[PDB]
Each structure stands twice: as C-alpha cells, then as structure tokens.
C-alpha cells in the first residue's frame, strides 16, 4: 500500500488535491421558501455533492485498497457526517449562518421553515463556532474529514477471519497515519508537545458531536421522507435506507 509509505507532507498534499468543489444550490431567489422547497434545495444539493464525495473518497490514501463492499459500507455509514463537516467548514467565516452553498446562506430563523430543522441548524452553528474558536486550519479539516470516512463505519464490519480482520488492520494503519499527519501539522505550526496532544484531542472530540448531528439529521431526513415532504433521489434513498438496516 503505497499510501502507508507517504510522508506527512505527502498526505496533506494528497488530501488537499482531493477536495471536492463547492457546488451551487438551485435556489431561485425570487420565490418564497416553503418547508417543501427548502428541503428540496438541501436534498438536491446533497445528491449532487454525493457524486463528488465518491470521487473524493477514491482519492483518500488507502481507501481504494479496500474491497468494494467495504468502501460501500464506509460511505453508507459516513456520508451525512462528511456533508455536515463540509458545511460547518464552509460556514466558519460566517457567524450565525450556514453556507450550504454560495447562493444558499441560511441563519437559524430560516431553518424554522422546516419543522425539526432549527434544532439541527443550532447544532451545526455551534460546531461552526467551535471551529472558529479553535481556529481550525484547512489542512486539519481535510484530515478530520478523512478520519470520519475511515472510522465511522469501521466497527459495523463483521469478522470472517483474515478477510475482515486485515481490512480492519489496514484502515487502522491509515488512521494512524492521519494522526501522525495531524501531529506533524501542529508541530510545524509551532505548538508545544503538550499543546499538540491537547489539540489532537479537542479536534477528535468534535467528531463525537458530528456523529450526533448526523444521527439526528438522518432521523430528521427519514421523517421528511415518511411525511412526503420531499422526493428523494434513488441515491439519497439508498444512502438513507442503509441506516434502517
């Protein structure tokens, strides 16, 4: 696995080059929001972002070493965590707002258009604030987003001796590499040894909050689906259904 042989600098550079584009929403700015129309915008966007995510995932070192079955389980597990951490990143420089897209910048009050949404908005906003407080750097962001991809689904594997186990090993080797890379960035940034471990922890603890947000957004998305608020694409339907079985 040539990926295991990468330096920290090579890991960072590869992750930066893999970054997906910032997409635009199909927001028609001279039409009144409804619950249905706002949900449509978010799910239309997500659907287009998913195709770009898949090509990004293929570009994360080690991901293409895994089987097709395992790549699927990993993306199925983490897709919404990844979209949300991207959103929180994009929003870093806009206090009080979520930059879903350059033409779709929403504050919490706009979240109230959709029932149950404001609660999720509020968690995303607080995560954005935390990112700002910590002064999260893009090099750290891309590492974290890659940790989510590799980690979130890693224990929902089963165990078929060597087969499942070595896919698990590999993933952990790669995760260990991203840790080394994170530490490297903080050292190059001049943080002390103590600050390095402290910051490493602060950043990883955020992931527990992103998981929480993904769990609640998946519940919320399921609810919108079950209430015929919005038509989901087959892709999004499949991604959502992976969380009900």
């Amino acid at each position: 696995s040539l990926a295991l042989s990468l330096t920290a600098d090579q890991m960072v550079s590869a992750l930066l080059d893999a970054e997906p584009p910032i997409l635009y929403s199909e927001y028609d700015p001279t039409r009144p929001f409804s619950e249905a129309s706002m949900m449509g915008l978010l799910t239309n966007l997500a659907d287009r972002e998913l195709v770009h995510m898949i090509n990004w995932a293929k570009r994360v070192p080690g991901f293409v070493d895994l089987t097709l079955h395992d790549q699927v389980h990993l993306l199925e597990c983490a897709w919404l965590e990844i979209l949300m951490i991207g959103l929180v990143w994009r929003s870093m420089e806009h206090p009080g707002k979520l930059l879903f897209a350059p033409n779709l910048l929403l504050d919490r009050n706009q979240g109230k258009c959709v029932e149950g949404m404001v609660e999720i908005f509020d968690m995303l906003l607080a995560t954005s604030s935390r990112f700002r407080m910590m002064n999260l750097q893009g090099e750290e962001f891309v590492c974290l987003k890659s940790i989510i991809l590799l980690n979130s689904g890693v224990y929902t594997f089963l165990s078929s001796t060597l087969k499942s186990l070595e896919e698990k090993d590999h993933i952990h080797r790669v995760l260990d590499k991203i840790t080394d890379t994170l530490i490297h960035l903080m050292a190059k940034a001049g943080l002390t040894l103590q600050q390095q471990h402290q910051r490493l922890a602060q950043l990883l603890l955020i992931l527990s909050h992103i998981r929480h947000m993904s769990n609640k957004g998946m519940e919320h998305l399921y609810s919108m689906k079950c209430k015929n608020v919005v038509p989901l694409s087959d892709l999004l339907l499949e991604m959502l259904d992976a969380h009900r079985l």
Partner: peptide, 9 residues
C-alpha cells in the same frame, strides 16, 4: 445499488 455502480467508475 447506485452507490455500488458509482464507486466502480
């Protein structure tokens, strides 16, 4: 499965 096909590209 759509996800499966997309990964194959």
């Amino acid at each position: 499965k759509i996800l499966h096909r997309l990964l194959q590209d």
